[PDB]
Design a protein around this nucleic acid. Structure first.
Lengths: 84, 98, 105, 95, 98, 80, 95, 106
DNA sequence: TAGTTATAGGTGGACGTCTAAGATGGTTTTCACATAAACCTTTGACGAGGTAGTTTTCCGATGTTGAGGGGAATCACGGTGAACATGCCTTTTGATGGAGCAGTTTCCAAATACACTTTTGGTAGAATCTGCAGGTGGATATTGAT
DNA sequence: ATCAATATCCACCTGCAGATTCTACCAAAAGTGTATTTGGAAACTGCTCCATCAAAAGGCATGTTCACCGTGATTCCCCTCAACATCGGAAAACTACCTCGTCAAAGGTTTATGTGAAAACCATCTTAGACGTCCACCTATAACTA
């Protein structure tokens, strides 16, 4: 089993980035953006997942539940609706 | 030969994407990025399908929401193009980079 | 026997709330009228959204209220939008609003 | 069996009440459910805190009020607060 | 006759005030503003001496902080001077005008 | 009557300087006053809501602080 | 008598344990006290919540841990979570 | 009798915390080691600040740590500043920091 | 560059509140033995479901080629804010008469805590829905060149 | 100033899935009713600390007038937007397959719920008394022209 993970952060496609950007009401997008973005996203995710897992860990569980993810987002002040 | 003007088929999307609700990142490339950041953080773990999407919904929403704020930072500096300088500011006041 | 909810003319479970305030360690002692009061606040707010949701679902030519309708409601509404400030709705979309600086000539 | 009691039954009741000819996606219902919950916690605790602040050892309808009057934006607070005292006072009379 | 250059004894103040901790509003005009807003909100109310300063400390530290963020907004527009346009952007991104 | 104008234009710029501020417009001083009012309003509103609840007629430091906490402005140094 | 319990007595103890030839203001003491208070509340609820999340009917040192790991930033969490498990193991042994 | 604090080698009141977690409706049941654990976390953090506060008070040539010193500590420090993000200190002042865009010419 | 305005400071002696050592009274806790009540560590075991693994399909991604036009780069020079003044209203910096509101001791109820005793939920378990989720034209705007 | 001509709504209509909508049944809760439990809001009452009005620095308040920074453009250099070409790789079925997270038991702690008896720690300040304000007096670092 198992395979390793390499630049999945680069797996967040430049178009997927601009699609998200357009939805913000965005007309002109620099080439430098796409990296910066990825950075921010990573940071975001890191911070969330960190707290998210801290719960999974505490539950004495090895599977990350939706609740864990949400209780983490709540903590973050990103209150999420639609996953219990 | 028919050609749309530079910065005018741009708006098509805006109007198109602002109206829809689907997620603008592919599930799978996202899938990996989550599993990576989590494994290269806490080894051999598992994610309920939902817990993955719940993250993506959130992640996407965040960035779109950030872009909004970013856009105004371009528009403020007379400019019309998003560049790192704007996001820096955007985050800076938001409080995460201050 | 009469349901405590009907004793206040409510659709929301007055008994449930009374239990849910115990099973939350909110205080040493829960009131008798508080689970009633609150159950109504919640009823009101639920109905208040649903009200704005229905119309939203109707403007977009549908029967069933879907996520987008709830967002189109909340975000287009003044007060709910303030109340649900730090809150994100799953499959919510966004209010179409382009800046009046990027528009053509 | 697992049993995870929700609200969908009541959210449906108060939907049919305003809009008798309108359905609702389970996804939307979930959002809706996360709401009534989120709202609950918000008020409950804000009021839980109150008793404590006031060295009071009992949660009362009076506590809910001030929590509601704090947490809720303008007209919405007014409208909610009203209906609260309204259902309560009905429960006091119709015992 | 001597004359200080424009916008340059300005700095002397910034440094001086950034070094000091004290309140930059006289208690009494503030005292007047507080008591006003409270009665213009609920008839005949008293205030703990502490309670007034407590609020002022809060009040200032906020403006203080706001201005900092407003500062950067100006500088982002390739500008040097703070204006309503900045505070707007500052408060809008902060989320109190958003 | 205009105690909001009692927040002196210099007191305003003194606070501004502390932010690291070089150039200040004339329009600012009004805008500022506005924001301050709004701030104060919002705080005092919630602050009094407590005083009122306590069945008290005197606004305590605690009331002021519990309000600031609610606002997400957590204050230290008044028994807070 | 009024009786208004603070922490100042202990705050000074640990102050002289780090700098024996250094004092404190009364106004700075109030800030210091508000800290230990806020920080108390912070982790506390966070952990109070954690029991409920995981349906546990009792707060344990364990809930404090994960709560600290959550509330506290990077290195300061590590250093804290340490002295915690430390003072704890000293109490268990020297009982 | 021995103080529960000394049973953990702490200056902070382990008994007080045990009572304070009951008188807060935090849970139906408080632990025995939790009031100990927490009392220490608090102890550590207190001392951690005081540490940075002392030096601040020393750099500014004084004996008694005043508010400004606590702010000069917290805001100059990386992590505390993050922890006390939404927090304001009475009589705190601010870190002197002018933008490197407003500074003179040479 | 050398000034000479402006206090960057800058370094040391008494009053002065206002640290903090003390003591004294508690006195309110804090501890420290009681006793089952019950909250939690296994500990099987059974499946959900989450990982991986395989495949076929087409649906976005990438990687070019232009080049319109947005970003900045500097000028005219308007004209908007910062000095450097005295002009003094008013905010400190001090007394002092009672509305409030804490600290006391209380029956009055207004919740806890149980025993059963009917329901209102709630999955589940299908049981049939029947709303809207794409499929191929199709009339219809509005760009962007004739 | 009128004609190409994508891509927009949008018109139906295939059909496919995700609502409700019965029909229970465990059956968890919720509710009915009674003693017990205590938290409260009840009325007193002695004062802390809140608002009264008034002596003299402190700093607010326009005034004058000049020095740079945008309610001016304009240029133009190269940024990234727009087709389009072309597969790589996401998606969208199913197939194992076995890893781990729940339902139930089941003592084994681990905790709470009484209260005598000494042990901090806090009103209560009481009283030394000590760091710091508060500025003299001249250093003395920058500054905007001599």
């Amino acid at each position: 089993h198992r395979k390793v993970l390499r630049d999945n952060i680069q797996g967040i496609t430049k178009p997927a980035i601009r699609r998200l950007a357009r939805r913000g009401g965005v007309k002109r997008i620099s080439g430098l953006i796409y990296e910066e973005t990825r950075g921010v996203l990573k940071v975001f995710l890191e911070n969330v997942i960190r707290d998210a897992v801290t719960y999974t860990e505490h539950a004495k569980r090895k599977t990350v539940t939706a609740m864990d993810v949400v209780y983490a987002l709540k903590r973050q002040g990103r209150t999420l609706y639609g996953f219990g | 030969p028919h050609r749309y003007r530079p910065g005018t088929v741009a708006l098509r999307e805006i109007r198109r994407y602002q109206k829809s609700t689907e997620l603008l990142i592919r599930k799978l490339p996202f899938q990996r990025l989550v599993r990576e950041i989590a494994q290269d953080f806490k080894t051999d773990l598992r994610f309920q399908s939902s817990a993955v999407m719940a993250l993506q919904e959130a992640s996407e929403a965040y960035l779109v929401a950030l872009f909004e704020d970013t856009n105004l930072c371009a528009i403020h500096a007379k400019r019309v193009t998003i560049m790192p300088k704007d996001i820096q500011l955007a985050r800076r006041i938001r409080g995460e980079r201050a | 026997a009469k349901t405590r909810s009907s004793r206040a003319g409510l659709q929301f479970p007055v008994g449930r709330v009374h239990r849910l305030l115990r099973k939350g360690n909110y205080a040493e002692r829960v009131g008798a009228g508080a689970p009633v009061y609150l159950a109504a606040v919640l009823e009101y707010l639920t109905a208040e959204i649903l009200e704005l949701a229905g119309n939203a679902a109707r403007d977009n030519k549908k029967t069933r209220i879907i996520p987008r309708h709830l967002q189109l409601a909340v975000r287009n509404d003044e007060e709910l939008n303030k109340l649900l400030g730090r809150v994100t709705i799953a499959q919510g979309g966004v209010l179409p609003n382009i800046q009046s600086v990027l528009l053509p000539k | 069996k697992t049993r995870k009691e929700s609200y969908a039954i009541y959210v449906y009741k108060v939907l049919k009440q305003v809009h008798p000819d309108t359905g609702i996606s389970s996804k939307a219902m979930s959002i809706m459910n996360s709401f009534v919950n989120d709202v609950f916690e918000r008020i409950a605790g804000e009021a839980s805190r109150l008793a404590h602040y006031n060295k009071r050892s009992t949660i009362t309808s009076r506590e809910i009020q001030t929590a509601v009057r704090l947490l809720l934006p303008g007209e919405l607070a007014k409208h909610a607060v009203s209906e609260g005292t309204k259902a309560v006072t009905k429960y006091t009379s119709a015992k």
